[PDB]
Amino acid sequence: GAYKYLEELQRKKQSDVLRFLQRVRVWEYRQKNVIHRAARPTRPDKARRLGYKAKQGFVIYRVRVRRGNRKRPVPKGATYGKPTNQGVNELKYQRSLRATAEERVGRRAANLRVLNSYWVNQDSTYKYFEVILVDPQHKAIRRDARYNWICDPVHKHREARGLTATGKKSRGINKGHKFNNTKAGRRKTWKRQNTLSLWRYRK
């Protein structure tokens, strides 16, 4: 309703008036741990258009990880082959540190069902992506009125899916030229299309 005024609010948090409030936002995010218990959402605008109902189910988590890349536990470079392929620190990851906010609390989500996710505040050491979950074994969810697909075996448990809301956040898998790469997947988008299908009735 009155979320139209919240739409304008974007860079006002960094302006010379609410810039002090920016630290107050990331304040509680670091004071708490990784896995804990939360209550009512802090942002009624974002945690709403992803699926909302004033009852007992829609919550907002608070996961805290590092900020950067990843280095594989190899004995100071167990690889070491080609000078271009080499570089244990040059291997600055490639394709996953965004679902991380769910990929670890997915064990805490395997017993539930992740709805969507978003962002609130960050620094230069940690990451804070608040994720909303919905309990699928809850009778209020199994019935309700709108949603009637939660009962059916549908979801992939958004922590090993790769097709999360934070995963479909990117992943251009449309139909155009910029979407012909991962249109099928990784193997079938190459192993299959490059296969000379030879029937019985050969030419």
Binding site: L9, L18, L21, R25, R40, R43, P44
Partner: peptide, 9 residues
């Protein structure tokens, strides 16, 4: 007022 962003307007 828990939402800090919902009091400045």
């Amino acid at each position: 007022v828990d939402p800090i962003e919902l009091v400045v307007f």
